[PDB]
């Protein structure tokens, strides 16, 4: 709902933008949920940031998988890219690669060259579904 969301991002720099993009991706991707949770920065501090967490559908060789991810929105959003992770369940393992480290953090050209209004969440997820579709970031263990 537009109301509950507006309250979550109370302490955001650009709330009107952040919510409208948020509403759009949650609509299109029914299984991504907005959530508050403390993020720990490189310095050691903890701000309470919104986290679009859930799964996205990703075709991989004839089969569609629900790849689990985390999209951390900084409070300066949309003028900085989200901080993106894959969130492997305990039965999955992270496939390390060019776009993924062992902590599950995602690295993409789209994130690097992020620029508002040129870039937004919907665009990022579109790209993700392509990158993971070619090279899955997570695999299920035997």
């Amino acid at each position: 709902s537009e109301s509950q969301l507006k309250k979550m991002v109370s302490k955001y720099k650009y709330r009107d933008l952040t919510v409208r993009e948020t509403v759009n991706v949650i609509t299109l991707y029914k299984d991504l949920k907005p959530v508050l949770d403390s993020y720990v920065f490189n310095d050691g501090s903890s701000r309470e940031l919104m986290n679009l967490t859930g799964t996205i559908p990703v075709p991989y060789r004839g089969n569609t998988y629900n790849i689990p991810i985390c999209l951390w929105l900084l409070d300066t959003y949309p003028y900085n890219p989200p901080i993106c992770f894959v969130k492997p369940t305990s039965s999955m393992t992270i496939k390390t690669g060019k776009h993924v480290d062992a902590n599950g953090k995602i690295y993409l050209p789209y994130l690097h060259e992020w620029k508002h209004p040129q870039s937004d969440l919907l665009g990022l997820i579109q790209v993700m579904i392509v990158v993971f579709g070619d090279e899955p970031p997570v695999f299920s263990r035997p």
Partner: peptide, 10 residues
Amino acid sequence: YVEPTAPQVL
């Protein structure tokens, strides 16, 4: 509710 899934390790 959807369960997360990933391709099986071969």
